[PDB]
Design an enzyme around this catalytic site. Structure first.
Site, PDB file in Angstrom:
ATOM      1  N   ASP A  47      -9.748  26.372 -22.065  1.00 33.07           N
ATOM      2  CA  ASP A  47      -9.190  27.591 -22.647  1.00 33.07           C
ATOM      3  C   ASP A  47      -7.816  27.385 -23.273  1.00 33.07           C
ATOM      4  O   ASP A  47      -7.216  28.339 -23.781  1.00 33.07           O
ATOM      5  CB  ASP A  47      -9.116  28.704 -21.596  1.00 33.07           C
ATOM      6  CG  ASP A  47     -10.483  29.152 -21.124  1.00 33.07           C
ATOM      7  OD1 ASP A  47     -11.493  28.619 -21.627  1.00 33.07           O
ATOM      8  OD2 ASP A  47     -10.546  30.044 -20.251  1.00 33.07           O
ATOM      9  N   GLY A  48      -7.305  26.159 -23.246  1.00 32.59           N
ATOM     10  CA  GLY A  48      -6.026  25.877 -23.864  1.00 32.59           C
ATOM     11  C   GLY A  48      -6.180  25.038 -25.110  1.00 32.59           C
ATOM     12  O   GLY A  48      -5.249  24.914 -25.910  1.00 32.59           O
ATOM     13  N   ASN A  86      -7.393  34.943 -29.219  1.00 35.00           N
ATOM     14  CA  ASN A  86      -7.343  35.656 -27.937  1.00 35.00           C
ATOM     15  C   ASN A  86      -6.591  36.982 -28.044  1.00 35.00           C
ATOM     16  O   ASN A  86      -7.175  38.048 -27.834  1.00 35.00           O
ATOM     17  CB  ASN A  86      -6.742  34.753 -26.857  1.00 35.00           C
ATOM     18  CG  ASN A  86      -7.717  33.704 -26.367  1.00 35.00           C
ATOM     19  OD1 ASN A  86      -7.321  32.616 -25.956  1.00 35.00           O
ATOM     20  ND2 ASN A  86      -9.004  34.028 -26.409  1.00 35.00           N
ATOM     21  N   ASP A 101       6.597  47.485 -21.634  1.00 29.00           N
ATOM     22  CA  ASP A 101       6.838  46.098 -22.006  1.00 29.00           C
ATOM     23  C   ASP A 101       6.264  45.766 -23.380  1.00 29.00           C
ATOM     24  O   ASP A 101       6.938  45.118 -24.185  1.00 29.00           O
ATOM     25  CB  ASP A 101       6.276  45.164 -20.942  1.00 29.00           C
ATOM     26  CG  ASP A 101       7.015  45.275 -19.625  1.00 29.00           C
ATOM     27  OD1 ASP A 101       7.982  46.060 -19.551  1.00 29.00           O
ATOM     28  OD2 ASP A 101       6.628  44.580 -18.661  1.00 29.00           O
TER      29      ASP A 101
END
Lengths: 297, 295, 294, 293
Positions: free
Chosen positions: A81-82, A152, A182
């Site tokens: 996933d990276g 993503n 935030d």
């Protein structure tokens, strides 16, 4: 249930590794030997072939000389996933099919196991393996010009600061809400299991065409992570009556500050990211949820 | 429900204004004139009586001259920030604090400004109900600096990126390792503060307990917990992590904590008494209704 | 925490989860050891009448020696301690709960080496957690209950929304609309109250929780109030149909317009013995049972 | 961007009222007289024209006789009337226009003020619509149902529930708790929202699966592609019957041998927008559930 389409037999392979991991050094060598054994041109990242770890081993130097944008026909990714995020970065246009292997930790984008990799790779090259056409977002940041393709999520949140953010969200010129807190995690269905999930977002299967809007700790307790149709045009810009500025991030990449004049526009891209599945789009996603994010355990 | 105990009649009043608001000038002038009318010494922040707005108005110069462990009672102007400033200024036994909401109503500002003279006279002379709000004695040790926190202490990924890996020790035992944006260990008074935006439940300020609330935890099964008040917390970075973390104290000075630094949290012995307009309970629910839209 | 027996224990009341063959054999081993010492053993009269326990003639030797309670031993997970509190509406004696298989929030003790663990509790001093309970009183147009985990007011054999008013010291706070409310103790914060989104409270926090079940309003979150408060829940006058009340999954009775339920923290807590300490036992229970970390 | 296609001019109108409300009695008279004023046949539910309120009023008796294949539907009431409209039309349902007299819902965009001008626009001109999705539901012990908001499988007159959920023949999950509230995007703002589900715009073609108070702390609501085949059935273990509801309609009891299958229907419900589908949905969020104050 889109099966596959090669038109012409594959000849170019772009192998991308997560790097900075000794555990991935040895399996990288075995795959490259088999890929080079077949009459297939192998592309590897320019920086990868010059690391001290790969240069020191003179044994692997036999095939290092046989390495080498718009001529890649198939992508193999190592890491969880990276790496697929980095794969999409190099392909802003039509990205070829990507097969991701998980060595250790299993992610939401890495279905294939490394055991018996020779048989699995031959099936993809020769036979047909089902794919998921994952959606991507094209974001334009207009300065008072610079496109991006995001797989993503894109995050608009307060960077180094203390005050709560005050940014306006527009949907086809029909301002819907001003989120205070935030920030916001506007994301694709593929990112529904990503950092957007940590903010309370529901988990969307990657075959659902939609765009999610999810806050990061909203000040209003009734603000829910809505999801909007895929073909809508979003536009996020700072509210005029708001102190301090906000920062925007693209899949954990370059952060640039947006001020009272800058606006970011989000729209579903026409160039999806095809990811090959080991069994099928449905079973692999549910298997990924339990094994990685503990969906039911 | 403890009411009041003056021992000696009040003589010193410390008035703190929210500052940076022209709408707060005239009511502040009226309150100061009323307080100076009675034989009560008035303390005002030294840097307050030097603003261009307060200096240009020569009419207020008549009472400007009469300003000035020596404070007996605190009057606060502003919303939910003025009491934070007052708590910061008083690290010891803070005197009773009365807050007025001029416009927006917060969780710590029960009194309305209408008929303020009668309310002030009742507070000075009569007995009014109070809430002994809890505070936290956070101590940061470097490889030395105590703070008193009323709402919350936050340990989060600051001017940086990537996930966080920080360990939380409770009475010497590693209860959990939180991964995500951070943790909002907080008092019951902070349960309606930024801790509430992170999924925490709303705790009444008479419940003696300490809350632990994550900020966007990576694990879906990680719910906020609340622990007994008399516990000794200790938060420090996990050894198997690279990016450092930043700690904040009620939106105040931020300092990065590296591998060798640890923060210890314990319930303070010096609570902050806030006077209630009606009673310790109904005011909280009214604040939940209008201030936060509890339903 | 500094447990004193005053007089050495002599009466033991053993409660089994029942309807479980897996708990038959371990029940036999403990009773033989407990009867070995000069200690009177109390067992529920309906426990010693099952066909399984009657068929085994080997255990009939000590069956006759069974039979004012000084100490309670419980077998089962999260379902036996609730029954233990039911039989003791007054001062319940200390309760030691064993888990055989599944591990719960109420059962710290492991069954392995049970002889050593039981002797330590009888002779030495162990650590306890004084679990809070609720004195629930229902008044009709009086039946008093003691609740350890939760009292739930929700729709029963019907299907419609609910409009019931929650009074707190005569200062009604909210009209909860939805499925219902899970007013509960801290011990019930790891129970059906938790399934509704309630934060998990350590059992040493003296407070009362109010957690709705699927509230209609998005901005309505569980609240926790001081322990010494008197709650009062009654149907709103402008509301059709009726609601049903449950007490730890026990007898349900419909409440109509004239019925009111009053909730107050009990003066008779439930002391539960912990294996190591009141704190680390609870955190271990969260991870192993409810998966608080993984 | 399809708006509307009458092909043949409307002549038949089915007017259904939420009933059990005196406040809706008077506006019902005004609309029916105006609709009957134009050369357009009006249908009314046969049980509507028998209440004491409608029989006692002799003033309205002039047109009561003229009440009587539906071409267009007019609904009165908030979020409780279109569910009844869906029930009467298991096939192709005509366009549905709903008026919110008082409370404002999600399926009722049109306001009653200046109703005559608004009705003329729908009949004569074109108005934007939302093709709301519906679920066809089969319960096999072959009684089908069409559901607009949600189908709920939960414990009923009893006291947890162990029921299995299958997706295209694969056991995706086993939900333990009150139950599962599988719903359409239109039902995302319904009782599915109270269970923690996200709010889905009705133009997203997907099916939602949301628990009702799940036992596990980590069990997030999931949404699946529209064209998938659901199949929910009781687990072989934990023998206790569960109950199924279809938008609050007849609650059945499912035993060990009963199976319920859910797929997206091919007969959507066209609800006419007031100004446009996107802005109207966000306006409804602010007033109904107070989305972001």
């Amino acid at each position: 249930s889109v099966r596959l389409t090669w038109n012409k037999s594959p000849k170019s392979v772009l192998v991308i590794k997560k790097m900075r991991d000794a555990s991935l050094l040895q399996p990288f060598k075995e795959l490259c030997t088999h890929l080079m054994e077949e009459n297939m041109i192998v592309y590897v990242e320019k920086k990868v072939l010059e690391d001290p770890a790969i240069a020191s081993d003179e044994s692997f130097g036999a095939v290092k000389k046989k390495f080498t944008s718009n001529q890649i026909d198939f992508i193999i990714c190592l890491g969880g996933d990276g790496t697929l995020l980095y794969a999409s970065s190099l392909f802003q246009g039509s990205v070829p099919p990507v097969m991701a292997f998980h060595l250790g930790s299993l992610g939401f984008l890495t279905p294939f196991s490394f055991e018996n990799f020779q048989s699995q790779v031959t099936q993809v090259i020769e036979g047909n393996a089902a794919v998921v056409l994952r959606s991507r977002l094209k974001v334009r940041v207009v300065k008072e010009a610079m496109q991006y393709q995001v797989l993503n999520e894109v995050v608009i949140d307060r960077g180094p600061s203390s005050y709560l953010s005050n940014v306006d969200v527009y949907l086809d010129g029909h301002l819907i809400t001003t989120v205070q807190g935030d920030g916001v995690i506007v994301s694709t269905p593929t990112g529904s299991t990503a950092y957007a999930a940590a903010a309370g977002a529901s988990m969307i299967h990657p075959n659902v065409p939609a765009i999610m809007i999810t806050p990061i700790c909203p000040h209003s307790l009734s603000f829910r992570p809505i999801v909007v149709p895929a073909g809508v045009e979003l536009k996020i810009m700072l509210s005029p009556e708001a102190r301090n500025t906000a920062w925007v991030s693209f899949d954990g990449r370059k952060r640039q500050e947006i001020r009272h004049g800058d606006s970011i526009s989000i729209t579903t891209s026409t160039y999806p990211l095809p990811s090959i599945c080991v069994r099928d789009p449905v079973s692999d996603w549910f298997e990924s949820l339990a094994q990685c994010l503990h969906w039911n355990v």
